[PDB]
Enzyme design. Structure first.
Site, PDB file in Angstrom:
ATOM      1  N   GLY A  27       3.647   6.051  10.282  1.00 40.82           N
ATOM      2  CA  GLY A  27       4.979   6.023   9.726  1.00 40.82           C
ATOM      3  C   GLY A  27       5.740   4.765  10.039  1.00 40.82           C
ATOM      4  N   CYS A  47       4.739   1.586   9.317  1.00 49.19           N
ATOM      5  CA  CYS A  47       4.510   0.433   8.455  1.00 49.19           C
ATOM      6  C   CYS A  47       5.790   0.051   7.734  1.00 49.19           C
ATOM      7  CB  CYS A  47       3.430   0.749   7.446  1.00 49.19           C
ATOM      8  SG  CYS A  47       1.822   0.805   8.214  1.00 49.19           S
ATOM      9  N   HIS A  54       0.801  -1.209   0.000  1.00 51.49           N
ATOM     10  CA  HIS A  54       0.000   0.000   0.000  1.00 51.49           C
ATOM     11  C   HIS A  54       0.848   1.280   0.000  1.00 51.49           C
ATOM     12  CE1 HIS A  54       0.253  -0.846   4.429  1.00 51.49           C
ATOM     13  NE2 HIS A  54      -0.081  -2.062   4.031  1.00 51.49           N
TER      14      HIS A  54
END
Ligand SMILES: *[C@@](O)(c1nc2ccccc2s1)[C@H](C[C@@H]1CCCNC1=O)NC(=O)[C@@H]1Cc2ccc(F)cc2CN1C(=O)[C@@H](NC(=O)C(F)(F)F)C(C)(C)C
Ligand SMILES: *[C@@](O)(c1nc2ccccc2s1)[C@H](C[C@@H]1CCCNC1=O)NC(=O)[C@@H]1Cc2ccc(F)cc2CN1C(=O)[C@@H](NC(=O)C(F)(F)F)C(C)(C)C
Lengths: 306, 306
Positions: free
Chosen positions: A143, A145, A41
């Protein structure tokens, strides 16, 4: 002596963390050999963050729509592919700090270390467990991920987790390093929610053995139980069933302490039925379930404080 | 969301760990530039382990009585000196992985990460605090001496602890990196024992603020207290006095949550007087005191979950 939530040394993983940017979206990636792994993503925009069609979003991207930054060095992307919920970016440079490594998909109840990262830069390291409901009780902000979870064995790093999502209860969901989620979760903004969780019984027993190794016996009793009778109490307190294989796995800790597994089960039964009466075990007023039998052996003395 | 005992990433310290041998005694050392720092009792033998005279033991040693191993590379010692309870071995090679670093002597109540090491090889990382009685509740076995504690700030490693001793209660004593013990302890086998410890009040308050940041208010109440009246309760529960400087330090967390410090003190007073009634805070059934106000700011969102 002592017993702490102990993580693996994180150096071998720190050297693999990078920053991946697509559009205005930046998150963390894992650089091993000439490949950077990151959540797919990264290709989503503000308007894609609901129900993205990732194959349709990705076909619209070229290699040069991805920026990979390792420290202050930009790595050029020369290929990309999506595998499940992970993007694999082939880059022009092999990571010279690549450790010996494996990707493993872990079972619920197993523990691992998390290297929390922001902007490709490591921030902290902590220990967690894969819960029975396949969430993790992490500590993650926006932030984070792409931060990964891992175990280390004789200088081989076994990566087992990549962070993707926070659920409404504040717990976390993510994937193995091949991009398959743990549990029934998706990388989409939909009604998902943790299923009901349970306490990891074999791990509580391991931690009681750790307490005995370190010299504390206050919670033991003279009783024993059958496996079936213990499990009838376990079920009542929302504990996982204990299997004969769990019993076998606890063999070494049982032998080192001289306490039969089913005798420790009777101690645990009494703790569940009575509470702790204001006392603590290894500094906790709760029954801790995020140490595996291996974690206890790894940290404790092989000599019991009798 | 989430809140974990979070250590600093340990890579910068892993690259500094070495093995120091004198006679049949081996323990860990810290290699920075061309100097290796380690506990001076590496020069003790089985027969010296009671009341050694270190100046007399050390004058009988030459540079070549010390072996320093960094991985599979032997470093040649070309000078030595004793500073307080630390031996400084000058070696022929500067550590190419030396990070930017400082030595700091910390105050009680401050936290740090420990990189537990055996045979010069890092084993695990965990977080601890300097207790008011200047012990630490570490997790250390035989062979761990010379392991260090540290904090990191903008890629500067501030070393604050080197491990030396285990006390009879199973807690740990050691030195700053200039070889001065924390607390009243000595590197000798004598009657020493931890003094009575106390709970670090400012840290408990910081952790209550962390719980509010992460969305939990169940323990708040409508009351306030004066600093003097709070401290009369603190004293009764073996908590450290709270000073105006502590109050000032908690200013930012108070502002981020909208809860005045003395209002949080009234919440803490009620928790001390009533207990938790079977409820938990950030996953603990005890009042946690090994997060500093800085630790909470470092880990938590700057945005409160209102
Ligand atoms: C991670 O850092 C990412 N941020 C972005 C930003 C843009 C694109 C891609 C990513 S990944 C965060 C970590 C997360 C943030 C909140 C605080 N604590 C955390 O762990 N991950 C997310 O924000 C994910 C990513 C995502 C991907 C596809 C989507 F269609 C939607 C999202 C939003 N998201 C969530 O975690 C959300 N949770 C859920 O949708 C669900 F169902 F899992 F609960 C959110 C409500 C934003 C927390
Ligand atoms: C550390 O690894 C060291 N081992 C050796 C071995 C030979 C020479 C020098 C050293 S340093 C251990 C770590 C310790 C071991 C026990 C399990 N958990 C731990 O943290 N440190 C020691 O064994 C120290 C070193 C020492 C130095 C000079 C002395 F005269 C005596 C010692 C013995 N020692 C202790 O920690 C003892 N404790 C105390 O004497 C006291 F007072 F602090 F409690 C011991 C009883 C051995 C634990």
């Amino acid at each position: 002596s002592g017993f702490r939530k102990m993580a693996f040394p994180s150096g071998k993983v720190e050297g693999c963390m990078v920053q991946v940017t697509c559009g205005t979206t930046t998150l963390n990636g894992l650089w091993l050999d000439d490949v950077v792994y990151c959540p797919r993503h990264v290709i989503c925009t503000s308007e894609d963050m609901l129900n993205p069609n990732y194959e349709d979003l990705l076909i619209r991207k070229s290699n040069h729509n991805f920026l990979v930054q390792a420290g202050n060095v930009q790595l050029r992307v020369i290929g990309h592919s999506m595998q499940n919920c992970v993007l694999k970016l082939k880059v022009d440079t092999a990571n010279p700090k690549t450790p010996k490594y494996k990707f493993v998909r872990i079972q619920p109840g197993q523990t691992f270390s998390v290297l929390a990262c922001y902007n490709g830069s490591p921030s902290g390291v902590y220990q967690c467990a894969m819960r029975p409901n396949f969430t993790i009780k992490g500590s993650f902000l926006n932030g984070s991920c792409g931060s990964v979870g891992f175990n280390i064995d004789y200088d081989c790093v076994s990566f087992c987790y990549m962070h993707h999502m926070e659920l409404p209860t504040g717990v976390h969901a993510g994937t193995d390093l091949e991009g398959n989620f743990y549990g029934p979760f998706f990388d989409r903004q939909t009604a998902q929610a943790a299923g009901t969780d349970t306490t990891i019984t074999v791990n509580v027993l391991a931690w009681l053995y750790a307490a005995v190794i370190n010299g504390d016996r206050w919670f033991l009793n003279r009783f024993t139980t059958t496996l079936n009778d213990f499990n009838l109490v376990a079920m009542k307190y929302n504990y996982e069933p204990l299997t004969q294989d769990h019993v076998d796995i606890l063999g070494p800790l049982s032998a080192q302490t001289g306490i039969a597994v089913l005798d420790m089960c009777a101690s645990l039964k009494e703790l569940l039925q009575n509470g702790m009466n204001g006392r603590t075990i290894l500094g906790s007023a709760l029954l801790e379930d995020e140490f595996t039998p291996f974690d206890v052996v790894r940290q404790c003395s092989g000599v019991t404080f009798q």
